[PDB]
Amino acid sequence: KNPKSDKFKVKRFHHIEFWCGDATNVARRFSWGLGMRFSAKSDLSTGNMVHASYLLTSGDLRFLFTAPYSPSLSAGEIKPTTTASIPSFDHGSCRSFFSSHGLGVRAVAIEVEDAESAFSISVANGAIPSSPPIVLNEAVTIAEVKLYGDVVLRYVSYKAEFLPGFERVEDASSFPLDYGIRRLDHAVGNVPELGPALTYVAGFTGFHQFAEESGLNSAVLASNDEMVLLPINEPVHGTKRKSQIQTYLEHNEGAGLQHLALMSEDIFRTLREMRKRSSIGGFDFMPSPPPTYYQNLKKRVGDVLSDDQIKECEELGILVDRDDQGTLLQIFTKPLGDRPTIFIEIIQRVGCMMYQSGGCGGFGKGNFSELFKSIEEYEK
């Protein structure tokens, strides 16, 4: 059931902002590893004396990487005279975030009809404000509320690129990489206590719960058309193997964003291209399932995937799960940086055609059991 209870008009995921120590090196690594092109910048060369911010895009997916300059460059500025292009940025907040959590997501940004109204309604309904609505060049409004940990939910609304004060990137440094990634499917938080986290976020958004022994409990919040999807996990303590959610919270110094799931238009091509680059600057993937997992795929999805398509999943280490509505192909990277905290998921969904409805096939929760069983069977 979908009660369509959003308290303001939400459109789509807009961008994800990483707070970094050095934005240049993270952005270049991510660009090569994920096949995202450099699309926009705001830095010293554009008159920004406060922060360096680089935008990568692939389809509709937008990854922003931001780091502070020396405060001495902007010491004479005040907020009314700032050269920052993102007015919510603060040197001390950014350094404190990074020192506490390491490399990770500061902002999950969604596009809304009216960022000022979304902010006001959110705070009226319990959201903890983080940055008030600020209108940029009479063209874009941006506002921020706390989501979980030190992650903010950022509202952006457009009267009619990316943000005022960003410049389009010179063609020569804009190499048109593309491994097939097209949009952000969902963004997932880890928290110590799921209940209070859900109540808080659903309280101020009106997002509804989307319909759904090893590590976690989780629930998913969704916008009216279920295209903005925000799962949240909590640990399940005193287990046989240690909870990966608890490990996250230990190494992250508390709650934060756990993973970003990136939809591909062709998950086979995306994984071929990403895996070719794992050991030359790109991303590594989690250890692949045993061959028993792929033999068991025939009985589970043999009506969705051909034998060749199942063998292609096996070559690439792709996992498969299935709803009553549709089927999910997914795979997980190793952690994106030094700490065993944030990672990326690549996904593609099949079914639920009307356009494809959001969350078709679920989130792969069946693959916890299915992986465990396949490895026990492979021990044989």
Ligand X SMILES: Cc1c(C(=O)C2=C(O)CCCC2=O)ccc2c1C(=O)N(Cc1ccc(C(F)(F)F)cc1)CC(=O)N2C
Binding residues, as ranges, are 186, 259, 345
Q: Which residue, 41 or 186, has its beta carbon nearer to Co ion?
A: 186
- What φ, ψ does residue 96 adopt, rounded to 5°? -65, -45
CB 316 within 8 A of CB 273: no
Site for a second copy in 85-114 (CB under 8 A): 95, 98-100, 102-103
In whole angstroms, the minimum distance from the beta carbon of 36 to a second copy comes to 11
Say which entry of ligand X, a second copy, Co ion, none residue 140 contacts (CB below 5 to 8 A, set by partner kind): none
In whole angstroms, the minimum distance from the beta carbon of 366 to ligand X comes to 8
Q: Is the dihedral of CA 316, 364, 327, 347 positive or negative?
A: negative
Q: What contacts 335, CB < 8 A, 6 or more positions away? A: 341, 342, 343
Tell me the window of 14-22, 126-134, 186-194, 366-374 that interacts with a second copy (CB under 8 A).
14-22
Closest CA to 332 of 254, 265, 274: 274
Contact set with ligand X (CB under 6 A): 186, 188, 218, 231, 233, 244, 259, 261, 286, 319, 332, 334-335, 340, 343, 345, 363-365, 367-368, 371
28 binds a second copy (CB under 8 A): yes
Q: What contacts 38, CB < 8 A, 6 or more positions away? A: 27, 31, 54, 55, 56, 169, 173, 174, 175
Helix-strand-coil split of the chain, %, nearest 5 = 30, 35, 35
In whole angstroms, the minimum distance from the beta carbon of 284 to a second copy comes to 7
In whole angstroms, the minimum distance from the beta carbon of 194 to Co ion comes to 16
Site for a second copy in 203-262 (CB under 8 A): 250-253
81 binds a second copy (CB under 8 A): no
Q: Which residue, 280 or 353, has its beta carbon nearer to a second copy?
A: 280
Annotated binding site for Fe cation: 186, 259, 345
Q: Which residue, 81 or 173, has its beta carbon nearer to a second copy?
A: 173
Burial readout 236-248 (b: 16 or more C-beta within 10 A, e: otherwise): eeeeeeebbbbbb
Say which entry of a second copy, ligand X, Co ion, none residue 158 contacts (CB below 5 to 8 A, set by partner kind): none
Phi-psi region of 253 (alpha: psi -120 to 50; beta: other; left: phi over 0): left
Say which entry of Co ion, ligand X, a second copy, none residue 343 contacts (CB below 5 to 8 A, set by partner kind): ligand X
Considering CB under 8 A, how many residues would be counted as binding a second copy?
A: 48
Say which entry of ligand X, Co ion, a second copy, none residue 368 contacts (CB below 5 to 8 A, set by partner kind): ligand X
Distance CA(14)–CA(62), nearest Å, equals 7
Tell me the window of 2-10, 186-194, 220-228, 273-281 that interacts with a second copy (CB under 8 A).
273-281
**Helix or strand (DSSP H, E) at 129:** strand 129-136
Give CA separation, 158 vs 134, 373, 375, in Å.
12, 49, 50
CA angle, 197 then 150 then 2, to 5°: 35
In whole angstroms, the minimum distance from the beta carbon of 332 to a second copy comes to 17
Closest CA to 335 of 275, 249, 248, 211: 248
**Residue showing the smallest CB distance to Co ion in the complex:** 261
Residues that bind a second copy (CB under 8 A): 20-26, 28-33, 38, 43-44, 52, 67, 69-70, 72-73, 95, 98-100, 102-103, 172-175, 177, 250-253, 278-282, 284, 336-340
